[PDB]
Design an enzyme around this catalytic site. Structure first.
Site, short mmCIF file in Angstrom:
data_model
loop_
_atom_site.label_atom_id
_atom_site.label_comp_id
_atom_site.label_asym_id
_atom_site.label_seq_id
_atom_site.Cartn_x
_atom_site.Cartn_y
_atom_site.Cartn_z
N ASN A 46 9.52 -10.87 6.41
CA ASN A 46 8.48 -11.34 7.37
C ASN A 46 7.06 -10.91 6.92
O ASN A 46 6.95 -10.00 6.14
CB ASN A 46 8.81 -10.81 8.76
CG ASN A 46 10.18 -11.24 9.23
OD1 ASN A 46 10.48 -12.42 9.21
ND2 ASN A 46 11.00 -10.32 9.66
N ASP A 48 4.84 -9.29 8.46
CA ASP A 48 4.50 -7.92 8.94
C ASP A 48 5.17 -6.87 8.05
O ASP A 48 4.93 -5.66 8.27
CB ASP A 48 4.86 -7.75 10.42
CG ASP A 48 6.35 -7.70 10.75
OD1 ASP A 48 7.16 -7.91 9.85
OD2 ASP A 48 6.68 -7.52 11.92
#
Ligand SMILES: [Cl-]
Ligand SMILES: [Cl-]
Ligand SMILES: [Cl-]
Ligand SMILES: [Cl-]
Ligand SMILES: [Cl-]
Ligand SMILES: [Cl-]
Ligand SMILES: [Cl-]
Ligand code: NA
Length: 129
Positions: A46, A48
């Site tokens: 992801n 993040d």
């Protein structure tokens, strides 16, 4: 391991997912197909920096420990590598905690966008269960 559609429905049924928190078995098979294409070894990184693991793409930000998601939790108390096993037990046990968390199966983006409001019973049709 790459599961067949009916093989996976039978495994999920034996582990107590049929009507778990009111979600029929077809909901769980639909989510697995669009999250992982029924592959227990699927990973995806992801933006993040967290990673999603296994047949139900469980995220390291909240649910497991992978050693590289700073300031994350491990709410299922498992290494993320346990979620890539041919034995789905760890993934199923962790998914039961997620679906109980308040948002139900909306936690899984592919379930909300591709399964919710569809004929999900189609996913277990023809299976010996
Ligand atoms: Cl299929
Ligand atoms: Cl169903
Ligand atoms: Cl970590
Ligand atoms: Cl934790
Ligand atoms: Cl752990
Ligand atoms: Cl299994
Ligand atoms: Cl719900
Ligand atoms: Na974590």
């Amino acid at each position: 391991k790459v599961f067949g559609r009916c093989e996976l429905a039978a495994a999920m049924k034996r582990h107590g997912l049929d009507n778990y928190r009111g979600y029929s078995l077809g909901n769980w098979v639909c989510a697995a197909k669009f999250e992982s294409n029924f592959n227990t070894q699927a990973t995806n990184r992801n933006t993040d920096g967290s990673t999603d693991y296994g047949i139900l793409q469980i995220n390291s930000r909240w649910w497991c420990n992978d050693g590289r998601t700073p300031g994350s939790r491990n709410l299922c108390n498992i290494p993320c590598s346990a979620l890539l096993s041919s034995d789905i037990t760890a993934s199923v046990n962790c998914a039961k905690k997620i679906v109980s968390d308040g948002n139900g199966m909306n936690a899984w983006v592919a379930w909300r966008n591709r399964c919710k409001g569809t004929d999900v019973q189609a996913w277990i049709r023809g299976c010996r269960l």
